[PDB]
Structure 1
Amino acid sequence: LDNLSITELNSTPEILDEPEVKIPTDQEIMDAHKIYFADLNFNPSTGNTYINGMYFAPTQTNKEALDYIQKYRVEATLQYSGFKDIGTKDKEMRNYLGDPNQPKTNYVNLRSYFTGGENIMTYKKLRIYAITPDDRELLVLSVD
């Protein structure tokens, strides 16, 4: 033996790598919209209960799929008109259920679409299509 020593060693590598983009598949995009809440308007005259907007609850898995989707296209049924397309608009990213504590999630503001100012009926036909940056629409909510 010879030249025995004890030395301090210093090295600070933290991550050395970053995650990929990992664009979601269609099935993941559809499952990201499985849980939802409907924002309703109830001004009491005779059970009005008209729709104001649509939430999409955030989970522990759907973050990257929800932030991948904007430009929701809606086909709803108006009070006087029938079932018709009402255009395409960007999302809004509001707090979930209006709670100051809950995080911000995708919000579809149905009052800003191409309605003639008419309310959108409840328990009628209602279709919402998520539009990807790849210009392909996927039906993510069906109410009949």
Structure 2
Amino acid sequence: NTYINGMYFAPTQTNKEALDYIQKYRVEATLQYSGFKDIGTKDKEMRNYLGDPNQPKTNYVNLRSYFTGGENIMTYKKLRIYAITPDDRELLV
């Protein structure tokens, strides 16, 4: 078993300013029991990329802070973005 903890999303390229425009993320994942359920939204945070203290700060999905009791597997899940007024869509598997 491998379980997924979080997402150090998009380490700092030469040009990513549009990530500063984003405030909310929304995720649907598969639980260990009754997979592919809808989970609500949270707000992104700042963390150093790959945990190294000599690194710029990036956006992080803290997947543990949601309406889950179980864990996550290497199978199907979806990840939608909220820009401030609309909804977008970014990530899948």
TM more than 0.5: yes
1:98 paired with 2:51, answer yes
Contact kept in structure 2, 1:76 and 1:85, CA below 8 Å = yes
- In 2, distance between residues paired with 1:104 and 1:85? 29
| Number of aligned residues | 92
1:83 paired with 2:33, answer no
Q: Deviations over 1:40-73 (max 9, x none)?
A: xxxxxxxx21000011133334431111112100
Aligned Cα root-mean-square deviation (Å): 3.4
**Structure 1 residue 89: Cα displacement:** 0.2
Contact kept in structure 2, 1:68 and 1:132, CA below 8 Å = no
- In 2, distance between residues paired with 1:114 and 1:88? 10
- 1:105 is paired with a residue whose SS is strand
- 1:97 is paired with a residue whose SS is helix
Q: Deviations over 1:88-139 (max 9, x none)?
A: 0001111111111111100000000111244455566666666657899998
Contact kept in structure 2, 1:72 and 1:91, CA below 8 Å = yes
TM-score of the superposition, structure 2-length normalised?
0.73
Contact kept in structure 1, 2:81 and 2:90, CA below 8 Å = no
Structure 1 counterpart of 2:61, from 104, 108, 112: 108
What is the identity percentage for the equivalent residue pairs of Structure 1 and Structure 2?
100
TM-score of the superposition, structure 1-length normalised?
0.50
Stretches (4+) displaced over 2 A: 57-63, 116-139
- In 1, distance between residues paired with 2:32 and 2:58? 28
Where structure 1 has 5 or more consecutive residues not aligned to the other structure, the ranges are 1-47, 140-144
Contact kept in structure 2, 1:94 and 1:105, CA below 8 Å = yes
- 1:114 is paired with a residue whose SS is coil
Q: Which has the higher contact order (CA 8 A, sep 6+)?
A: 2
